[PDB]
Amino acid sequence: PVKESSFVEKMKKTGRNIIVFYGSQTGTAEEFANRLSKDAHRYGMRGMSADPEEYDLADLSSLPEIDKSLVVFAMATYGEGDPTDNAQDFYDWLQETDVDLTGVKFAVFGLGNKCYEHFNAMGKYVDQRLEQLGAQRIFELGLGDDDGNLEEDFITWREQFWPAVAEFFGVEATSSIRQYELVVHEDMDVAKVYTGEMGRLKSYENQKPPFDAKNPFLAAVTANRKLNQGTERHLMHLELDISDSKIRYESGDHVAVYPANDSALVNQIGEILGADLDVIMSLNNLDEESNKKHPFPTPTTYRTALTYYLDITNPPRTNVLYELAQYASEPSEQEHLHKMASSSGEGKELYLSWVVEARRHILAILQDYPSLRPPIDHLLELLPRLQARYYSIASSSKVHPNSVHITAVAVEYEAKSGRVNKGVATSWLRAKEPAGRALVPMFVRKSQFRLPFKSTTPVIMVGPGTGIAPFMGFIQERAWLREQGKEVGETLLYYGARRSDEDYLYREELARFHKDGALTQLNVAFSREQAHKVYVQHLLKRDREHLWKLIHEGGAHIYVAGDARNMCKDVQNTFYDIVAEFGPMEHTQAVDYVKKLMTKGRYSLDVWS
Numbered sequence: 282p283v284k285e286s287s288f289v290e291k292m293k294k295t296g297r298n299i300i301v302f303y304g305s306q307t308g309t310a311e312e313f314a315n316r317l318s319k320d321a322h323r324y325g326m327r328g329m330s331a332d333p334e335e336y337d338l339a340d341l342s343s344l345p346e347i348d349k350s351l352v353v354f355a356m357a358t359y360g361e362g363d364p365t366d367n368a369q370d371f372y373d374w375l376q377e378t379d380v381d382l383t384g385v386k387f388a389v390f391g392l393g394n395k396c397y398e399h400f401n402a403m404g405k406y407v408d409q410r411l412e413q414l415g416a417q418r419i420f421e422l423g424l425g426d427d428d429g430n431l432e433e434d435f436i437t438w439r440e441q442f443w444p445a446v447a448e449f450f451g452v453e454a455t456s457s458i459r460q461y462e463l464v465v466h467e468d469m470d471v472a473k474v475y476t477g478e479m480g481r482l483k484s485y486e487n488q489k490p491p492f493d494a495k496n497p498f499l500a501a502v503t504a505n506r507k508l509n510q511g512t513e514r515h516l517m518h519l520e521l522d523i524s525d526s527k528i529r530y531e532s533g534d535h536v537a538v539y540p541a542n543d544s545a546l547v548n549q550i551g552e553i554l555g556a557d558l559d560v561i562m563s564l565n566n567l568d569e570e571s572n573k574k575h576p577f578p579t580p581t582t583y584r585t586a587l588t589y590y591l592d593i594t595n596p597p598r599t600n601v602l603y604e605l606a607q608y609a610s611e612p613s614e615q616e617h618l619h620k621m622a623s624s625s626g627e628g629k630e631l632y633l634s635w636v637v638e639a640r641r642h643i644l645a646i647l648q649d650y651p652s653l654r655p656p657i658d659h660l661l662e663l664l665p666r667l668q669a670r671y672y673s674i675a676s677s678s679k680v681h682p683n684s685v686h687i688t689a690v691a692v693e694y695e696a697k698s699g700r701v702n703k704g705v706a707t708s709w710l711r712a713k714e715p716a717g718r719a720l721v722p723m724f725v726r727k728s729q730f731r732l733p734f735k736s737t738t739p740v741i742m743v744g745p746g747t748g749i750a751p752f753m754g755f756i757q758e759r760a761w762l763r764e765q766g767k768e769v770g771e772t773l774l775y776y777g778a779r780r781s782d783e784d785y786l787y788r789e790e791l792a793r794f795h796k797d798g799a800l801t802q803l804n805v806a807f808s809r810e811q812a813h814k815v816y817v818q819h820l821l822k823r824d825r826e827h828l829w830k831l832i833h834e835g836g837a838h839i840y841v842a843g844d845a846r847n848m849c850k851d852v853q854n855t856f857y858d859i860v861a862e863f864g865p866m867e868h869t870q871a872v873d874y875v876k877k878l879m880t881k882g883r884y885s886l887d888v889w890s
């Protein structure tokens with residue numbers, strides 16, 4: 282991953298004095314970082330956001346060479362509280378370097394979901410580490426939260442941070458400064474225009490290994506079917522064919538897919554703006570001396586950008602709102618949009634409840650504020666990149682070597698906005714028909730969710746709802762280990778659904794596995810076949826005695842998947858009580874015991890929200 286030259290020098294030659302780095306894997310930290318970088322303007326200073334992977338942080342010690350220099354970090358934490366992929370490099374350096382950062386002014390804003398254990402472990406580490414190296418914190422450590430409203434935590438922090446910096450450096454506060462320039466292309470050859478590929482032009486038709494995030498492999502959907510018997514929701518099973526892709530994976534890994542936005546939605550946005558979505562165009566950084574020449578693959582059409590490259594369904598951030606206000610001919614509306622940036626008062630309230638709460642996407646806002654009619658080109662520059670969506674492979678590669686399986690629930694809910702929101706990836710995937718050739722752009726991502734190495738070790742799997750997913754690959758694999766002739770320890774599944782005739786995923790397959798003996802136990806909690814709720818943990822508590830046996834002496838591995846919100850957190854506490862009672866020990870020591878399994882690789886997680 283060839284590094285760019287000294288970022289300090291890039292600042293010198295560009296007149297910059299502040300730089301923001303992002304530890305972003307889904308784009309959050311990256312937009313904050315850009316927003317932050319943009320702000321520099323308001324105070325006679327100039328900034329720049331940058332991926333830390335592309336640079337060499339050892340150069341922080343050269344940062345003092347620039348007057349009123351400052352460096353911000355917007356790191357995001359990942360599973361078990363580790364650096365984001367792009368920050369891994371920087372993380373190790375901080376863990377080895379002893380370079381003197383005397384003179385370095387810095388501030389850290391951490392993006393971490395509070396209901397996470399290592400709530401912002403990364404951001405804390407960087408805040409604390411740059412200090413030990415001799416740098417001086419210029420503003421308190423920010424600890425944004427994804428479970429509440431990171432967007433507000435970011436604004437609270439943002440409004441306080443800048444004054445501090447201006448106060449400190451002693452500068453006063455200073456106009457829509459567009460970042461790109463529109464260039465319409467008219468006769469341009471069709472063979473050189475992007476039509477949805479993520480990387481090199483034509484890479485989707487001319488598929489060529491290796492296949493990663495930047496050059497995904499379009500696998501053909503060979504099976505797409507309804508898994509739940511009932512009709513309240515739509516739970517599906519898909520099978521992607523990775524034949525001839527040289528792609529490798531193991532049960533417990535994730536598969537990432539790049540989706541396409543709803544054609545109807547994209548059509549309405551262009552319609553309500555009175556724009557021709559078929560105009561081929563390009564957007565080039567107005568800042569000739571910038572690394573990001575284009576906000577997304579160009580030349581391309583507006584239709585193609587809204588469909589494959591942009592996020593047109595999540596609630597717009599306050600910064601986007603504020604920038605749009607100037608385009609609302611009706612005063613009271615312009616004022617509303619402006620006041621969405623507000624840190625307090627009814628401004629911050631209107632935003633939290635009318636935008637975030639109601640789940641109003643870009644189109645909804647355009648419709649609910651009829652005087653708002655921004656020019657398409659500027660709007661595209663403000664919207665964020667469409668992110669890939671991850672899924673837990675529901676197959677064992679030892680069994681389905683040329684197939685990757687997906688277990689997903691289609692997202693479709695009622696927003697308070699009054700309309701029906703559709704999940705981007707799940708709607709798209711649900712629509713893919715084996716077409717007797719439906720292609721899904723994708724790539725695999727290694728994880729640390731792994732069955733034991735000694736096939737004889739006991740395996741306790743807890744995965745209600747769509748959390749079964751990884752476990753199907755696990756079971757197929759332990760079912761196969763027996764067939765081979767190997768000795769397989771106990772395999773216990775703890776699963777849950779609402780009703781056995783509603784959404785009992787893989788009811789047949791799991792019955793077979795149980796009959797054969799691949800499943801030592803198949804405990805299923807139907808939370809809705811009776812007045813009171815019965816969940817997987819209730820079953821874990823029931824079987825406390827036996828489970829402690831498999832744990833304290835059997836050396837069993839525990840795996841929890843599915844809801845990260847509360848199903849786990851209850852399942853985690855249920856393990857605490859098991860341990861506390863069958864040890865025995867006091868609660869506090871049960872918690873240590875369990876926590877020690879998590880670090881010894883005997884307690885794993887694959888949970889999402």
Ligand SMILES: Cc1cc2nc3c(=O)[nH]c(=O)nc-3n(C[C@H](O)[C@H](O)[C@H](O)COP(=O)(O)OP(=O)(O)OC[C@H]3O[C@@H](n4cnc5c(N)ncnc54)[C@H](O)[C@@H]3O)c2cc1C
Nearest residue numbers: 670671672673688689690692694704705706707747750889
């Ligand atoms: C590591 C990992 C593993 C995962 N594994 C799987 C898996 O194997 N199977 C699976 O089904 N999913 C899994 N997911 C989730 C998956 O990545 C997607 O988030 C999910 O499929 C939704 O995709 P979408 O683009 O259709 O939804 P989007 O269009 O991105 O919408 C998602 C958002 O809609 C909002 N929303 C949904 N319901 C409501 C509501 N009722 N009220 C208000 N807001 C709501 C929330 O903001 C939610 O985050 C996993 C995620 C991660 C990160």
Ligand SMILES: NC(=O)c1ccc[n+]([C@@H]2O[C@H](COP(=O)([O-])OP(=O)(O)OC[C@H]3O[C@@H](n4cnc5c(N)ncnc54)[C@H](OP(=O)(O)O)[C@@H]3O)[C@@H](O)[C@H]2O)c1
Nearest residue numbers: 690745746747777778779808809816817844847848851890
């Ligand atoms: N809430 C959101 O806005 C939001 C947004 C995106 C995704 N999601 C999550 O994505 C998933 C979508 O559905 P799904 O098929 O995966 O799951 P699901 O069908 O909603 O849940 C599967 C089983 O888990 C049970 N359960 C509920 N809470 C539990 C808990 N606290 N402890 C143990 N079991 C619990 C459910 O029972 P009951 O349901 O009968 O209680 C059901 O029996 C859910 O986790 C959903 O919450 C939520």
Ligand SMILES: Cc1cc2nc3c(=O)[nH]c(=O)nc-3n(C[C@H](O)[C@H](O)[C@H](O)COP(=O)(O)O)c2cc1C
Nearest residue numbers: 305306307308309310358359360362393394397401
């Ligand atoms: C698979 C997964 C694991 C996560 N693990 C953690 C964690 O351990 N600690 C934490 O604070 N946040 C965790 N988060 C939440 C992210 O830290 C948070 O959503 C942040 O907004 C991500 O920003 P990004 O968009 O730049 O990645 C996790 C999120 C996902 C999807």
